[PDB]
C-alpha cells in the first residue's frame, strides 16, 4: 500500500462524501455529476492533510475540507453563470455543503473558534481580490500573479491553515499554509493553461498572454521554479511532510512539459 | 421610545452592513441595494428583544443583520434579475457571511452552538428552497409547506442564534417560535406585494388568490393563527412585551392593506346577514340589500330591497344586529 494508493482512496472517499451530501439536499443528477468531476479539488485536501498522523483524523479533516472547497467552487459557478446548471440548486447546495463543512471542521478543531478566525482573517483580501480580478483583467505576468495570489494562493492558504488547526499536534501551521499558497499558484497556472482551450478563456488568461506575446515563456518557467522551490522548502520545515516532495515535482513538471509547449 | 430604539437599531445595522460591503469592494449600487433592505435590517432588533445587556444586544443585532443580508444576496444571485454584478454579489455575500460567523461565535454561549444551529436543519432549509422552485405551489396547503422552509425555518435559525448569543434569560424555544411565526406573516406580505412590484405569478400567493386556487378566508385564518403563535411566544416568561404592537402591526397591515387588493367586493366570503321575525315569518336579509337604518332605544329599525321596487321592513334588538348593520347606523 503506497502513497498513490492513499491519495486515490482519499480522493474517492472525499468524492463520495460530497456527492452523498449534494444528493441528500436535493441536488439533481447533473449537479451531482458536476461535483464528482471536480477531481483535483477533491484530491487537494489529501495533500493539505499530509502532516496529520492519525489516519482517522486525517480522513475526517480531508473530507470536511473537500465539502467547503466544492462549496466555494459552486459559488464560483454561480457567479460566472455559465455551466447550464440550475442556479437555485447551485446556490442551495453551495450553502448546504459549506454549513456541513463548518460543522465538521469545528468538531475537529482543537479550538472551534479558530475555524471562524481563519475564515474571517483575510476574507476581505480574498473576496475583494476576486472582485478586482474580474474587474481589471491582467495584461502581463506581474498583474497575473498578483490576482492569482488571491483567488488561488490565499484561497488554498486558508484551507492549509484549517488543516493544521483541525489536524491535531505535530503541525507547523505556517509551513502548511506556505505549502498551500505556493502549490495553489502552480495549479492555478495549470488551470489557466488548460482552460484556455477547454473554456475559450481570453481576457486575463495566462495562456492568452503567452500566445499574444504580453508574457514571456522563460518568465513563466521562472515563476514555476520559484513556486517549486517555495513548496519544497515548506514541506521540509519540522515536523516535515516528505510525502509531498514527489507531488510538488509532479504538478510543476506537468506544467513545464505538457502545458507550456502548447502556448509557445 | 421603543419605536426610537427600533429605528436606531435599524440604522446601526444599516451602517455596519454597508461599511462591510464597501470595504470588500462592493460598488455604490450594491451598497445601495443592501441599505434598502429595511425590514431585513430591522428584524434582528425583534429577535434580540430578550437581550438584557444593551452592548451585547447591539452586537448580536448587527451580526445577525450581516448574515441575513448575505443570504438575501445569495438569493439575488440564484434569481440573477437585480442588474447587480454577479461577482460583487457572490463575493460580498461570502465576506458578509464570514464576518457574521466570527461575530456571533464571539458572543455565543458555547463554541459549537452557532455551527450546530446552522447545520441542524440546513437540509430542510436548502432542499426546501430547491423544492419551492422545482414544484410551484398550487393551493394554500402547498404554499404554506414551502413557506415554512425558506420563510419560517430561515428566520427561526436566526431566532435560535439570537438566543444562543444573547447571554442569560433567553427562552430559546420561544424566541425561535416567534421568529418562525412572524417570518410567515412577513413572507405572505411579500408575496402579496411582489405580485405587482415584481410581476411574480407561479407559486405566488396573490396569484393563487386571484386565480381562485386559494380562498380569502383561509388566508385570513392562517394570518390569525400566525398572530396568535407569535403573541404566545412573546408572552412566555421572562417575556418580550415590546413585540406585541409589532406582531399586530404586521398582521393587521396584511389584513387591511394587502388582502383586499387580491379579493374584490367584500372578500371575507361570509356575506353578513340580519335575522328577524316580520309578520309572523322568519326572515334573513343580506346587509347588501339593506337601504335605510336607524336607532330607537336599543332597537335597530330598517328598510331593505325585497324584489324589484319592492321594499321590506324590520327591526331587531341591537343584541341581534351584526357588526355590519350597526356600522351602517353611524354611516347614516
TrEMBL record, chain A:
Q: Which InterPro entries match?
A: Isoprenoid_synthase_dom_sf
Record-given protein name: MoeN5
Amino acid at each position: 500500500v503506497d502513497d498513490d494508493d492513499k491519495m486515490l482512496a482519499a480522493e474517492a472517499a472525499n468524492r463520495d462524501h460530497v456527492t452523498r451530501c449534494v444528493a441528500q439536499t436535493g441536488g439533481s443528477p447533473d449537479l451531482v455529476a458536476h461535483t464528482a468531476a471536480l477531481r483535483l479539488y477533491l484530491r487537494v485536501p489529501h495533500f493539505l492533510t499530509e502532516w496529520t498522523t492519525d489516519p482517522d483524523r486525517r480522513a475526517a479533516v480531508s473530507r470536511a475540507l473537500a465539502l467547503d472547497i466544492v462549496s466555494m467552487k459552486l459559488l464560483d459557478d454561480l457567479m460566472d453563470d455559465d455551466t447550464g446548471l440550475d442556479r437555485v440548486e447551485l446556490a442551495c447546495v453551495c450553502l448546504r455543503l459549506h454549513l456541513r463543512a463548518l460543522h465538521e471542521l469545528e468538531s475537529l478543531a482543537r479550538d472551534p473558534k479558530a475555524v471562524t478566525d481563519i475564515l474571517e482573517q483575510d476574507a476581505v483580501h480574498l473576496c475583494g481580490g476576486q472582485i478586482r480580478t474580474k474587474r481589471s483583467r491582467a495584461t502581463n505576468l506581474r498583474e497575473w500573479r498578483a490576482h492569482a495570489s488571491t483567488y488561488g494562493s490565499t484561497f488554498l492558504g486558508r484551507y492549509g491553515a484549517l488543516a493544521a488547526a483541525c489536524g491535531g499536534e505535530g503541525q507547523p501551521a505556517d509551513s502548511v499554509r506556505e505549502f498551500a499558497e505556493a502549490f495553489a499558484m502552480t495549479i492555478t497556472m495549470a488551470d489557466d493553461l488548460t482552460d484556455y482551450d477547454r473554456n475559450g478563456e481570453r481576457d486575463g488568461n495566462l495562456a492568452h498572454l503567452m500566445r499574444t506575446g504580453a508574457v514571456a515563456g522563460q518568465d513563466v518557467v521562472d515563476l514555476l521554479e520559484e513556486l517549486r522551490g517555495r513548496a519544497l522548502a515548506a514541506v521540509a520545515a519540522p515536523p516535515g511532510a516528505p510525502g509531498l516532495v514527489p507531488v510538488v515535482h509532479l504538478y510543476t513538471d506537468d506544467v513545464l512539459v505538457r502545458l507550456l509547449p502548447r502556448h509557445l
